[PDB]
Amino acid sequence: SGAIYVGNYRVVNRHLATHNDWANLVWEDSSRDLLVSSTTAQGCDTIARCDCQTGVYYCSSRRKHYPVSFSKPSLIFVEASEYYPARYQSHLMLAVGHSEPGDCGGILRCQHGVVGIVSTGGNGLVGFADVRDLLWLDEE
């Protein structure tokens, strides 16, 4: 589990979105495994705007932050997990690292701020849904 809290927005894995998230929907994309909802209090995270390929991600299934190199966002075939089938997912970044289903929501961060959240994994590759293209998260 986990979210990004940027201004009055809440960024979560679409598959982990709550009823309240869907009842306060700003934007959602199944292909990206992303859903954004409204908040009342302002959030403490800042979004990276950058093409960084190095950063650090939180891995709840290890209680550890790991430094990783990661691929630029792209359309990758993801095998089946507990929450999705063997399908394709867009705006995905992969690193070599440990990931389990409950690690989804863990932040990936670079020197510029939050890059993305754990979304996919399999055979020692953790996948992150990118948010750095969501400029609209910075305004209104």
Ligand X SMILES: CNC(=O)c1cnc(C)s1
Phi-psi region of 33 (alpha: psi -120 to 50; beta: other; left: phi over 0): left
65 assigned ligand-binding residue: no
Return the residues of window 13-32 that contact ligand X according to CB under 6 A.
none
Site string for ligand X, 53-92 (x = CB under 6 A): ----------------------------x-----------
50 assigned ligand-binding residue: yes
The pair phi, psi for residue 37, each rounded to 5°, is -125, 165
Cβ neighbours for 80, distance < 8 A, ≥ 6 positions apart: 86
Please provide the distance, in angstroms rounded to a whole number, between the alpha carbons at the two ends of the chain.
26
Return the residues of window 96-135 that contact ligand X according to CB under 6 A.
99-101, 103-104, 118, 120-122
Nearest C-alpha neighbor of 15 from the set 115, 116, 120, 88: 120
Residue 50 interacts with Zn ion (CB under 5 A): yes or no: yes
- Centre a 10 Å sphere on the Cβ of residue 45 and count the other Cβ atoms it contains: 17
Residue 112 interacts with Zn ion (CB under 5 A): yes or no: yes
52 assigned ligand-binding residue: yes
Choosing among Zn ion, ligand X, none, which partner's interface includes residue 43 (Cβ < 5 to 8 Å by kind)?
none
Residue 49 interacts with Zn ion (CB under 5 A): yes or no: no
**Is 36 within 8 Å of 27 (Cβ atoms)?**
yes
Catalytic residue among 33, 91, 103, 130: 33
Choosing among ligand X, Zn ion, none, which partner's interface includes residue 93 (Cβ < 5 to 8 Å by kind)?
none
Burial of 10 per CB tally in 10 Å (0-12, 13-18, 19+): buried
Which residues form the catalytic set? 15, 33, 104
Binding interface with ligand X (CB under 6 A): 81, 99-101, 103-104, 118, 120-122
